[PDB]
């Protein structure tokens, strides 16, 4: 059968996995109850690891707990192995939904912009009962939210029946792009994945540097190399999502000063973010073809990816 | 997950216990202990002397029924379930036995077990080098004379690489150097014995690392100067940030206070040449990850998905023409991790209806089954829980006997014995066989259903020994392209060494291609009449799962198949490459070359130093070499004979360099030191993706992979993902990309003034 072979590239965080599950769910086996039971552990491992990140941001920050009775909770959680939870009980469930609940720890979750918390704490925190109960099981949704850093290079095939993508999935971080190179032959196509929502964030790699002007950068340059001379490019402007909160809060006139566009509007935005990817790049050779997206977000990868299939067809045959 | 040895209130205090053999004459009554780290089981006896049993050397613990037993002493009942046997000694072969009757009843047993723990615990065996000489420094101390001094002599012994120097040593402790003279356990405490090999054992090379980076003010180093030493020089670079997030301040502070001894250092969060020694040596900066050492490997995937430690006429202790056959060798093999031991079977005598084990026209003792059989169902599962295979090579020429063979398989191994296939996998085409997850605790019968040597001619099969055999029915190969036609995960083949070195050499990418679905038993051939070995890594590399050799001879073959089944818990089944393992793929095991979607890896080894390597002055050299695909493989590489000396031998020669591993992920580095003659000091097998960068101690193994105590090298290395010799440039710009684009806006923002 026809075999093409897509590379999902990203600074780190953008959401390359993510965008793999939507393709399993759509095009592939999707997940049964047994599958889902496989991320039972994964949910709880990030209500801890998230809970300890703001139980570090409290002292870093020097932010008090509103109440008294939190600070032995928060005592009880910051000692938690997070490799090793298998289960979530009490005291653990009471004790977290109790920091959570403290004007202290919301206030502190307000300036998360100040520190590294993944994306899908609230999603979870907020929904704590249905995660606590011994019956649970994770919703799909549950599944696409979850956080697992991804290392390595990890070769997925999906048979869309007129071709078969092989679409390959790699680490965002700095260290993981010196393996990116042996993933480069015979590449037909590069989708590249942006987070809209990182304009006020910094790296994890390296805390003074800004999230999206490592992607930009990322991009601007890897559209250049040689390997790609004769494959498309097609860059998701992914998590829009969590660009339609933020920007009511935090400028992007603050983090990119040239950007002269209104406040806290999330097309305009989203409109110069794009700008600076695809324009004046003094080597404007490709066609790049965008969309914006949200990867957890079924029905949107859906209905982009289906316009992803054709253009990548149409420019091979 | 793992554990550190605990040692049990009771093993601490000690139980009486009556220590004999088949000669002893008078009840011997001696009080057993183990010291509170785990080292020696030590008695006292009737002399006040003492004796030390050194617990990593430790084979196998035995009571009840399984303990050893004699008769002319005797001593009425048999239930006596307080004998204890002890096993040790330095591979399979040549085994010691120890024999300790309790006074007391409900002892034994918790002796038994807790002694067989210490003895296999995975923390102990790889221990930081600080640990093996604490363990030194224990044995110092139980090893004392009849009046519970210290014999002087006996340091002078356990350091006979240089008397005359260790007597200045202990007299700058001021301690006694004369070989008359003792010294009280009172003042010999582990500070007197650091200073004493401190001041005996100087470390020229140590001072080169702290020179190195940095402090030319060089005294000492900064908390900020070590945590970039321990992020940078020491960190994997393979590893991803997030996963493996790099050391804080304060966690650079806990070392200091772990650490340093000068108690005002410490107060100014600095760290000395002597408190940096004792981290080189400690429990953080071992070579290899816990990770690597532990069960970690994925143990769902299909039987034919992972490489299985095999023997091949596990019941030979010597040669295969003539010689002795055991029942000892089954009960070792098991225990040392194999997965797989083989049952020359012939067939019983009229009168005497039981079936014998041994070779063939060869005058080799034998040995009955039903012996073997019941050695199996004991030592199975005493070191691995995952599946145990019994290749039988039936010579049964009798339909009573061969049906009492099978009726033994069920009555020994009893629920243990596969006699069914499992509800989820029928034995129908197209099926995967088995996890060894799915199969814990079971015993997989191997023999027919309905210079090759004796495996050229078997007898049929009858449907006794025909309906215990089901997921690992041995049928006579034809091609790869019938047993693809076929379709059959239950149906594996037996291929003698020159016969499996044909079919790698002529179709490599289709015995691959069979290895995902089907299982491949190679054997050495009839020639190596003195057991000899065939390098198993030349089958593994073409996903070769049961590659069998002779356990009783530990040349580098053996010594290679030891090294990589210590890791994922000594299991005895490690996980095949993703590459050679998936339906999806396939890659040339002779490229030249590196294999897209594959990581390549380079490897700069560089050997510094060792330390206490011989008993006697002599020069030591080391062999670097690498295991895996042929393209991964160097049999080459030697350091220069040591200055002259076997103490702290310093070696300045360029590294030793693998700049291209194809397959990083099935080579394994193999490090072993000489004395000048040819003398095996000791050596070390590290998986190439798992070893990590910066100067780490490699504390050295015998030929049967266990732990020596004061040998040991320091060596230097840096474990990197590869990047082709040209594409350097975009590897950086992909890395940290913004200052690429950093310079390319700066220039072209200097030229705006010429439009
Ligand atoms: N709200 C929101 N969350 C997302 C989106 N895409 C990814 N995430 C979440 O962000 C986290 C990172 O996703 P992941 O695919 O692992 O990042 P990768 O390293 O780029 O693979 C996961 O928890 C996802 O659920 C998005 O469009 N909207
Ligand atoms: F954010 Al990643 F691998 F891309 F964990
Ligand atoms: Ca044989
Ligand atoms: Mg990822
Ligand atoms: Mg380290």
């Known amino acids: 059968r026809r075999e093409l072979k897509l590379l999902l590239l990203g600074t780190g965080e953008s959401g390359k996995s993510t965008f793999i599950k939507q393709m399993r769910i759509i095009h592939g086996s999707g997940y049964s109850d047994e599958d889902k039971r496989g991320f039972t552990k994964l949910v709880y491992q990030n209500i801890f690891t998230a809970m300890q990140a703001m139980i570090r941001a409290m002292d870093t920050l020097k932010i008090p707990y509103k109440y008294e009775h939190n600070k032995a909770h928060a005592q009880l959680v910051r000692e938690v192995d997070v490799e090793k939870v298998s289960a979530f009980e009490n005291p653990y469930v009471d004790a977290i939904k109790s920091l959570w609940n403290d004007p202290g720890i919301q206030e502190c979750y307000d300036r998360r912009r100040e520190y590294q918390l993944s994306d899908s704490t609230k999603y979870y925190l907020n929904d704590l009962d249905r995660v606590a109960d011994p019956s649970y099981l994770p919703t799909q949704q549950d599944v696409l939210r979850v956080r697992v850093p991804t290392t390595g290079i990890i070769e997925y095939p999906f048979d869309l029946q007129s071709v078969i993508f092989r679409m390959v999935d790699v680490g965002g971080q700095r260290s993981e792009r010196r393996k990116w190179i042996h993933c480069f032959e015979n590449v037909t196509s590069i989708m590249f994945l942006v987070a809209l929502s990182e304009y006020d964030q910094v790296l994890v790699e390296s805390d003074n540097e800004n999230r999206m002007e490592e992607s930009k950068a990322l991009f601007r340059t890897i559209i250049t190399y040689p390997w790609f001379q004769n494959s498309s490019v097609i860059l998701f402007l992914n998590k829009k999502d969590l660009l339609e909160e933020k920007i009511m809060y935090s400028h992007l006139v603050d983090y990119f000063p040239e950007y002269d566009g209104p406040q806290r509007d999330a097309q305009a935005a989203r409109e110069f973010i794009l700008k600076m990817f695809v324009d004046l790049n003094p080597d404007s050779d490709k066609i790049i073809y965008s969309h914006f997206t949200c990867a957890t977000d079924t029905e949107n990868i859906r209905f982009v990816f289906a316009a992803v299939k054709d253009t990548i067809l149409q420019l091979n045959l | 997950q793992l554990e550190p040895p605990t040692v049990v209130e009771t093993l601490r205090r000690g139980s009486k216990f009556i220590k004999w053999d088949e000669e002893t004459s008078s009840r011997n009554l001696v009080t057993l202990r183990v010291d509170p780290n785990g080292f020696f089981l030590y008695w006292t006896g009737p002399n006040m002397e003492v004796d030390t049993l050194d617990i990593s050397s430790i084979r196998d613990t035995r009571t009840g029924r399984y303990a050893r037993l004699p008769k002319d002493p005797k001593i009425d009942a048999r239930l006596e379930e307080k004998l204890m046997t002890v096993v040790s000694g330095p591979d399979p072969v040549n085994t010691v036995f120890l024999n300790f009757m309790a006074v007391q009843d409900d002892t034994a047993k918790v002796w038994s077990e807790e002694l067989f723990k210490l003895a296999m615990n995975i923390l102990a065996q790889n221990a930081s080098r600080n640990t093996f000489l604490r363990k030194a420094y224990t044995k110092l101390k139980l090893q004392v004379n009849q009046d519970g001094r210290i014999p002087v002599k006996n340091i002078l012994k356990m350091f006979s690489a240089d008397k005359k120097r260790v007597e200045t040593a202990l007299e700058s402790c001021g301690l006694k150097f004369n070989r008359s003279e003792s010294i009280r356990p009172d003042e010999f405490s582990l500070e007197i014995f650091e200073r004493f090999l401190n001041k005996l054992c100087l470390r020229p090379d140590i001072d080169k690392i702290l020179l190195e980076i940095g402090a030319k003010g060089k005294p000492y180093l900064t908390l900020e100067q070590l945590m970039d030493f321990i992020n940078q020089k020491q960190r994997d670079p393979r590893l991803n940030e997030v996963l493996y997030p790099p050391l804080r301040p304060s966690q650079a502070r806990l070392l200091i206070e772990k650490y340093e001894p000068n108690q005002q250092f410490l107060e100014r969060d600095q760290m000395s040449m002597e408190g940096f020694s004792r981290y080189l040596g400690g429990e953080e900066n071992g070579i290899l990850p816990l990770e690597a050492l532990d069960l970690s490997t994925d143990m769902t995937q299909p039987l034919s998905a992972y490489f299985i430690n095999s023997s091949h006429n596990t019941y030979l202790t010597a040669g295969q023409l003539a010689g002795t056959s055991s029942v000892e060798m089954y009960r070792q093999a098991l225990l040392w991790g194999c997965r797989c031991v083989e049952l020359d079977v012939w067939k019983g005598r009229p009168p005497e209806e039981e079936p014998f084990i041994t070779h063939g026209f060869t005058m080799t003792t034998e040995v009955p089954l039903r012996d073997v059989l019941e050695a199996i169902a004991e030592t199975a599962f005493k070191t691995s829980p995952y599946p145990v295979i019994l290749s039988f090579e039936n010579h049964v020429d009798s339909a009573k006997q061969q049906a009492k063979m099978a009726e ?93 070195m044909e079919q790698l050499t002529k179709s490599p990418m289709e015995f691959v291609e069979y290895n995902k679905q089907q299982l491949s038993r190679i054997y050495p051939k009839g020639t190596r009449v003195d057991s ?224």
């Open chain 2, 408 to 500: 033994y398989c069920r009555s020994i191994f009893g629920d243990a014995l596969l006699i069914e296939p499992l509800d989820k996998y029928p034995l129908a085409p197209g099926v995967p066989l088995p996890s060894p997850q799915d199969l814990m605790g079971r015993i997989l019968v191997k023999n027919k259903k309905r210079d090759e040597g004796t495996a050229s001619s078997e007898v049929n099969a009858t449907e006794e020994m025909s309906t215990l055999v089901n997921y690992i029915e041995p049928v006579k190969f034809k091609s790869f392209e019938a047993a693809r036609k076929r379709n059959k995960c239950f149906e594996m083949s037996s291929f003698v060494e020159t016969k499996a």
């Open chain 2, 532 to 755: 000899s070995n065939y390098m198993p890594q030349l089958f593994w590399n073409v996903g070769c799962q049961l590659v069998a050799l002779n356990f009783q001879t530990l040349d580098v073959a053996m010594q290679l198949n030891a090294g990589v089944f210590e890791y994922n818990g000594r299991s005895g089944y490690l996980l095949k490459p993703e590459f050679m393992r998936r339906p999806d793929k396939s890659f040339d095991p002779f490229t030249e070359v590196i294999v897209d979607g594959i990581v390549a890896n380079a490897l700069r080894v560089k050997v510094i130093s060792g330390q206490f390597l011989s008993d006697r002055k002599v020069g030591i050299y080391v062999e670097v070499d690498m295991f895996g695909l042929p393209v991964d493989t160097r049999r080459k590489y030697r350091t220069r004979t040591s200055q002259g000396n076997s103490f702290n031998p310093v070696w300045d020669e360029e590294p030793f360099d693998f700049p291209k591993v194809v397959l990083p992920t099935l080579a394994s580095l193999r490090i072993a030191a000489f004395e000048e003659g040819g003398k095996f000091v000791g050596h070390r097998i590290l998986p190439v993706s798992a070893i990590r960068s910066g100067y780490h101690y490699v504390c050295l193994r015998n030929e049967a992979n266990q732990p020596l105590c004061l040998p040991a090298l320091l060596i230097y290395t840096e474990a990197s993902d590869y990047i082709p010799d040209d594409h350097q440039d975009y590897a950086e710009a992909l890395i940290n990309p913004i200052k690429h684009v950093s310079l390319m806006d700066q220039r072209a923002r200097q030229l705006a003034a010429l439009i």
